[PDB]
Design a protein around this ligand. Structure first.
Ligand SMILES: CCCCCCCC(=O)SCCNC(=O)CCNC(=O)[C@H](O)C(C)(C)COP(=O)(O)OP(=O)(O)OC[C@H]1O[C@@H](n2cnc3c(N)ncnc32)[C@H](O)[C@@H]1OP(=O)(O)O
Ligand SMILES: CCCCCCCC(=O)SCCNC(=O)CCNC(=O)[C@H](O)C(C)(C)COP(=O)(O)OP(=O)(O)OC[C@H]1O[C@@H](n2cnc3c(N)ncnc32)[C@H](O)[C@@H]1OP(=O)(O)O
Ligand code: FAD
Ligand code: FAD
Lengths: 607, 607
């Protein structure tokens, strides 16, 4: 079979046995979707991901997209286009799409679990297929007239792009110089060159593409808040019928050569530089670009983190299958006996340490993104957590930099253990892990670098939030702590919580001390990413412990066979993570408590 | 041009810190002075930065192509040009014994020279490892065999080490390749070997000497039944060296790898194509694994230096980018969206990461140069006051540090080098993504990190009765006890030293409990790799601190300009490492002190 090793068993356990998302299924917005159908959908997309979607994982890498300068188009490999079709023909492009655009209503915790499987099998496939959901974002932000266009874009399944980055404006989006010039008929002419645009062309996958392009109107202010968002389609079209018309002046001029994620065309997007204007329409006919664009950035950040977690999961499972089957060496209890029976490497403790590490973090991460997703529907947050819409929004925003930044960095780091398990064979392309790594290194970069995530997590999602969302999550962790076979984990989780509390209190000191000493703010930057990672380790230990608490209930209730084995591994993962991962936060708090600006005062030439 | 060298740091280490110049001009190195050595370093560094780094990208993008019916590989023209450059300079004969045409040199200077090739195009050095392996065959050979070794050395033949079979990788002793004795005293070798580096080399050499482990018919099991054989690709005149008829050792496969592509990694079939693979019993004694380990020691030393070289040019590339790249405002001006833009070396997190790349890069350069000062008894005497026997013991202790800690550290910290480049870090246009891909293998070949950790504990500490480790502990303890501008660094080093002693005592405890309960040995396994990494971090902080003390002396004396900056960066690096990396070992010690066999007893099906 294929490279993509699924785990719907773990998804359902999270959705149903731990977070209780089924408690909303069958009622209200999800009236016509019951718990059984949800499991069947999860099983269906997992089989589609393992088959036709994973079919072209290797081809997309070894036979990558090509730029045609004769036509300013991109060619994609045949096998990848075949997988794209399999996804369209199942309607898996309409996941969580609003009902009035042809989607099936769902809790987003379910939606992202469905999404995970595509991202584990062929992540670029899902990215090419985010058009409809970006069309919906255009709908929510559009005028009534534009809402008709957006509807056409969703129903005909046009592709879509996020167009922010320029050569001199990446994390500083506000530094972009692309301009918008208003015309007499109310349209705008966009003029500029954007860089690193995903899916900017897609060969003949779609009949049109919607480019969501950020630009600065003539005479607008500086920074992000001078920016406006424009709807710029690859082709002109009839605003009633949808009939595709004349080519619009927005062309790809180049296709990057990347370490991984190769079948994802990443292009220089040139607007107006080829003899026809790039006409764009101002979204909602208001000047509000960076706020509007962030509805899409927020989705992209959720996707990138889930992708990372999706890829660590099948990394681990590939490594496990290999370890179970590979004979090498004697049991360590028989080390000196050179006649002793050879063993499979799962008998070797460093192998078992590295499998338990991959397992605990993979499953720990899956819980986080699903937990995060239970705060994205007001109805689910109320039903499962008892929190009103405003608190739900805030905790979702708090948790996104975790899903993206902590997921980003952990999945790549732990795939090293994945590959390691294969011994020398991990370095061969014959096995999928080296590509998992190359495909995953980008997740720490696009949709905001990890540092950008950490600076958002602290400055916006905590400080500007006055600690409300952070205080709410800490409250749930404390409640689990204060409540037998779980006493030791709880003791370690209590240390870990104090440690994170320590780190937050320390950093906030450095920040508010900056008013009498401006250089103090650098200590916030020096610690922000480490603080983010600790919060991600704290959440993983907590969520993993919750899961063990339930596995104990189900075991005491008499689970047997394959179920028993599953629940037994939750206990193992939870105690391992408590004992081997969490303690390191104590020394991290202390390191953060003793930060200084020596590294800032040092002259650049001394590096 | 991708490769950024650092002769200055090498000289600073060799001369101002370790005083390797105290042997130049006397005894074995009569005819080589310190001024000459500085010149050899800067020459090979210029060659590596030019003709040898020139084909780094080409070797990767246009990797060797295998012809299966000729059993040969074609290497890309540009890489072969680099090899001839290496040859025309005698850089294939670095440290080779004088009686083989080599220039006598202390091994510390030798690995310093080699570092440049490994940084510019590591696979080029591997192809060029022939003469040094001929010197090993020489040392282990009969008088008649010594004549062959000399021919092979001065004629510049390539060479391989042939151990791995499909089901014998870490367990070399499981290998089934057989050796059949012939009436005249030769042997016919029959078997298939896997993953053999440089097993074919296009036309770079007129012969290749395969050093093959094989089990003579009727010899015992495990590694002790093995014997080493001299198996030449071509038969040759034992007197004149004239090349004769092809020997029956043919490559039947070449792997497709994640990185290090230009290095042919071949399946080697001995005796399978109707022509016998004649082999000669090296030294005409049965002592294979002992003999092959002379080469395995070399290979382990090289892999580590390779990992370290790759991180150094990784960091230096990252530093140049960060110096030139403008993005964002100073965070003391974060709120003002009209504040001047700054180069990213101003941003705390970028400076945290550069400091991290620097401290580890230069910490690891010190470790491998330190290790190399115990590989000449003459140098060990002059620089350390240590007799030949302890010198060999200390060198054996440090090799798994160089290999195990060096491989894992370089790869991980390269993640920071790529991050510093932002999105451009994911592009092939820059060399870091290849650094990563080319570097992942170092944790695997020449023994995996688990194998390194296991060698380190059981053989280099326990079987050693702890005597080498105690010597090193002494030198760290002596540095702590000795100005007061390093008082904080010394306290942190004292903690760390104690923490590592904690680890070593704990693991020794688990070993001795296995006398009464064999399963306790698993605890040693669970902690071995963490322990190895701990000793590595300790050594880096100790060596970085020694460097700071010498930089303080040199700054106090009135250093200026570029020298001043260099010395200042050593101080900042030693202080950062002590305050940001060393404390984590305390947590690690507590984790090791509390290991359990839960993860061992768990049923495999629960993973
Ligand atoms: C196409 C499918 C596949 C795509 C895969 C990935 C695609 C990409 O990579 S797209 C390029 C992604 N680019 C980024 O993510 C930018 C990363 N850099 C940052 O985020 C910086 O921190 C920013 C925010 C750009 C710094 O600019 P500032 O002007 O300095 O930001 P402010 O803090 O002043 O906020 C101003 C304005 O911006 C909105 N905003 C900021 N942050 C958020 C968040 N987390 N969530 C929602 N909105 C946010 C706000 O509207 C804010 O206004 P306010 O007055 O402060 O409320
Ligand atoms: C030329 C192009 C560049 C090539 C680049 C490298 C390519 C490669 O990867 S080459 C293949 C490398 N293969 C390995 O590294 C094997 C890794 N596995 C191990 O090392 C295992 O731990 C071994 C040692 C194979 C375990 O087998 P055992 O029989 O169980 O070993 P013992 O501990 O009982 O000792 C047996 C015998 O071997 C000698 N020995 C062991 N360890 C060493 C070390 N570190 N250094 C020197 N010699 C060693 C000893 O002679 C020992 O006998 P003794 O009675 O204990 O003295
Ligand atoms: C494969 C790929 C696909 C992409 N697709 C898209 C797309 O579809 N749409 C789109 O709009 N963009 C896209 N991008 C652009 C991507 O979002 C940017 O690369 C990313 O936001 C980082 O910007 P940059 O490359 O300019 O890095 P830089 O902004 O130059 O950052 C370089 C380094 O500086 C650090 N840094 C920068 N500013 C700060 C600060 N204020 N504080 C601390 N550290 C800082 C960063 O951490 C990083 O390590 C894509 C990029 C890639 C690689
Ligand atoms: C690019 C490349 C080039 C190579 N070149 C050469 C060459 O020139 N010459 C040569 O002789 N060999 C060469 N090799 C072989 C290489 O040395 C082996 O791949 C390596 O030693 C690991 O062996 P293996 O692949 O069989 O993996 P395995 O031994 O099967 O390792 C699988 C996993 O099990 C673990 N494991 C195995 N045994 C134990 C144990 N006892 N205790 C704890 N953990 C254990 C390992 O750490 C690893 O995580 C090369 C390999 C590669 C990838």
């Amino acid at each position: 079979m294929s490279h993509y090793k699924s785990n719907v068993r773990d998804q359902v356990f999270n959705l149903f046995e731990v977070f209780g998302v089924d408690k909303v299924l069958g009622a209200d917005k999800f009236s016509d979707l019951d718990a059984d159908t949800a499991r069947e959908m999860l099983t269906e997309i997992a089989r589609l991901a393992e088959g036709p979607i994973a079919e072209s994982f290797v081809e997309g890498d070894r036979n990558p997209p090509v730029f045609d300068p004769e036509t300013h188009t991109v060619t994609l490999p045949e096998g990848f286009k075949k997988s794209m079709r399999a996804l369209f023909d199942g309607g898996w492009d309409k996941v969580g799409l609003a009902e009035h655009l042809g989607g099936i209503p769902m809790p987003r915790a379910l939606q992202w679990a469905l999404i995970e499987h595509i991202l584990g099998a062929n992540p670029a496939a899902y990215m090419y297929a985010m058009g409809p959901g970006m069309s919906e974002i255009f709908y929510n932000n559009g005028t009534d007239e534009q809402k008709k266009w957006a509807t056409i874009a969703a129903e005909r399944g046009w592709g879509a792009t996020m167009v922010l980055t320029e050569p001199d404006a990446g994390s500083d989006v506000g530094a972009g110089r692309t301009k918008a010039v208003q015309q007499p008929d109310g349209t705008w002419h966009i003029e500029g060159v954007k860089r690193f645009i995903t899916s900017a062309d897609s060969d003949d996958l779609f009949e049109n593409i919607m480019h969501l392009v950020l630009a600065r109107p003539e005479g607008a202010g500086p920074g992000t808040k001078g920016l406006s968002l424009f709807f710029v389609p690859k082709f002109h079209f009839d605003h009633e019928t949808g009939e595709i018309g004349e080519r619009n002046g927005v062309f790809v001029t180049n296709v990057e050569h990347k370490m991984g994620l190769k079948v994802s065309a990443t292009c220089e997007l040139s607007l107006g530089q080829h003899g026809i204007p790039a006409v764009g329409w101002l979204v909602g006919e208001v000047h509000n670009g960076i706020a509007q664009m962030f509805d899409v950035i927020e989705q992209a950040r959720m996707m990138v983190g889930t992708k990372a977690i999706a890829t660590l999961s099948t990394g681990y499972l590939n490594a496990l299958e290999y370890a179970k089957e590979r004979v090498q060496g004697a049991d360590m209890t028989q080390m000196t006996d050179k006649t002793a029976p050879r063993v499979t490497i799962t008998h070797h403790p460093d192998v078992r340490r590295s499998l338990m590490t991959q397992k605990a973090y993979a499953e720990g991460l899956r819980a986080i993104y699903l937990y995060t997703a239970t705060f994205q529907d007001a109805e689910v947050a109320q039903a499962v957590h008892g929190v009103d819409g405003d608190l739900a929004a805030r905790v979702n925003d708090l948790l996104l930099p975790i899903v993206k930044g902590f997921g980003s960095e952990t999945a790549y780091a732990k795939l090293t253990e994945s590959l390691q398990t294969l011994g020398g064979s991990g370095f061969l392309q014959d096995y999928p892990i080296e590509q998992y790594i190359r495909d995953s290194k980008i997740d720490s970069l696009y949709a905001g670098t990890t540092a950008i995530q950490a600076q958002d997590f602290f400055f916006r999602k905590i400080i500007r939030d006055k600690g409300q969302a952070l205080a709410y999550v800490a409250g749930e962790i404390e409640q689990f702590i204060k409540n037998g076979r779980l006493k030791t984990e709880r003791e370690l989780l209590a240390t870990a919580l104090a440690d994170v509390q320590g780190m937050a209190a320390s950093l906030t000191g450095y920040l508010m001390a900056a008013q009498e000493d401006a250089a103090s703010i650098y200590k916030v930057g020096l610690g922000s990413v480490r603080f983010l990672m600790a919060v991600g380790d704290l959440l993983s230990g907590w969520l993993l412990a919750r899961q063990a608490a339930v596995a104990i209930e189900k075991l005491d209730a008499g689970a047997t066979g394959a179920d028993k084995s599953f629940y037994e591994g939750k206990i193992a993962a939870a105690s391992f993570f408590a004992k081997n991962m969490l303690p390191l936060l104590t020394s991290t708090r202390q390191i953060i408590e003793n930060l200084d600006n020596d590294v800032m005062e040092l002259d650049e030439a001394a590096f």
